[PDB]
C-alpha cells in the first residue's frame, strides 16, 4: 500500500507517534517519505546481506528476523514479513523500540539526511487530523 501524506500522518497519530519520546509527528511522516516513499511493501537488500523492510525500512540485521541475515539480533522480536503489511501496527511498534535507544531517530539514515534539522512539522500541515 502507498499511503498519502496526510493519510499516513493521521494513521501515525492514531498509532501514538504525535509526541513519542521527544519526536514530533512530522519527524515520522518525513522519515517514511524518504525511507520508503510511503510504500508499506518497500524492501531494499543491503551489502551485508541484510534487508530493510517496510514503510520505515527496518533492518534485518538488528531489528527483525527474516531468517536470511548473518549476525541477526532481532531486537524487535518480530518476523520481517510482519513489517510488510498495509497495517502499520508492527512497523510502528518496532520503530518505537528503535527510537527508544540513545541514538533516537538517527537509526534512520534518510531521516538523518533529509529530515533532521528541517521544518518537519511542514509534513503534517494542510492535513485533517
Amino acid at each position, epitope marked *: 500500500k502507498v499511503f498519502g501524506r496526510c493519510e499516513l500522518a493521521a494513521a501515525m497519530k492514531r*498509532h*501514538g507517534l504525535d509526541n513519542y519520546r521527544g519526536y514530533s509527528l512530522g519527524n515520522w511522516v518525513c522519515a517514511a517519505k524518504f525511507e520508503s516513499n510511503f510504500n508499506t511493501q518497500a524492501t531494499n537488500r543491503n551489502t551485508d546481506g541484510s534487508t530493510d523492510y517496510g514503510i520505515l525500512q527496518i533492518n534485518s540485521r538488528w531489528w527483525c528476523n527474516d531468517g536470511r541475515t548473518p549476525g541477526s*539480533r*532481532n531486537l524487535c522480536n518480530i518476523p520481517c514479513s510482519a513489517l510488510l503489511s498495509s497495517d502499520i501496527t508492527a512497523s510502528v*511498534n518496532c520503530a518505537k*523500540k528503535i527510537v527508544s535507544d*540513545g*541514538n533516537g531517530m538517527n537509526a534512520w539514515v534518510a531521516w538523518r539526511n533529509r529530515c533532521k534539522g528541517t521544518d518537519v512539522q511542514a509534513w503534517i500541515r494542510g492535513c485533517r487530523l
Partner: antibody
Amino acid sequence: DVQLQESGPSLVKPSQTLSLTCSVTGDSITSDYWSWIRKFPGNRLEYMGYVSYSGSTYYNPSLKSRISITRDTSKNQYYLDLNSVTTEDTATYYCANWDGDYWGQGTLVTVSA
Amino acid sequence: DIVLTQSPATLSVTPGNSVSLSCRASQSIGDNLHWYQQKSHESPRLLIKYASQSISGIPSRFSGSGSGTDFTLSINSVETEDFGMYFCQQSNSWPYTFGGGTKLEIK
C-alpha cells in the same frame, strides 16, 4: 526460551551501595533492551531504568543519579547498582526485558541499620 | 513526569460478572499505555500493550481501549484467577510511570 532471575543480598545497611544481578538464559543480552523495576511496600511501582543495545542508559530522575545499570556479555548478565541507599529504598526489585514479556521472580531488599 | 491516575482504587466483584478499570494520564500519550496484572508473591504480567493490542498467551476476556488521556481495561466475565492488582504504565515519555493500581477482589 528466555528466563530471567535476580540475585544479590536481601539485607543492606543505610548509606551503602545496593547491587543486584539479573542472569539471562535462553538468548543473548545483546539481543534486547534490559530494565529494572521496583515495588515499594504500598503497591507502588517505579520504573528505575533500562539499558538499550547501544549501551545508552535511561534512568528515572526520581533516583537522583544514584543508579547505574551495566552489562556483561561473557556472563550474559546485567546489573543494578544503587548508591547511598536509605530506608526509602526498601522494596522488591525485578529485572525484565524492555518489552515486558519476560520478568524475573523479584527479590526483596531491605535497608536497615 | 506524566502522572497516571487509576480508579477505582479497589473493586470487589463476583466471578462471572464483568468489570472495567480506569487509567487517566495527565497529558496525551497517544496509544502508549500498557496494562499489567500482579498477584501477591509474583512479578507483573503484561496483559495489553499499546492501549488495545492483544498479547499471546493472555485470556481473551481481557481487552483494552482508549487513547490520548483516557484508557480502560475490561475483563469480560471475571474468573477467580483474575483477582489481584492491575497497573497501567505509559511509555510515551521518559521516565516511564505507573498508575497507583486497582485492586480486584472477590465480593
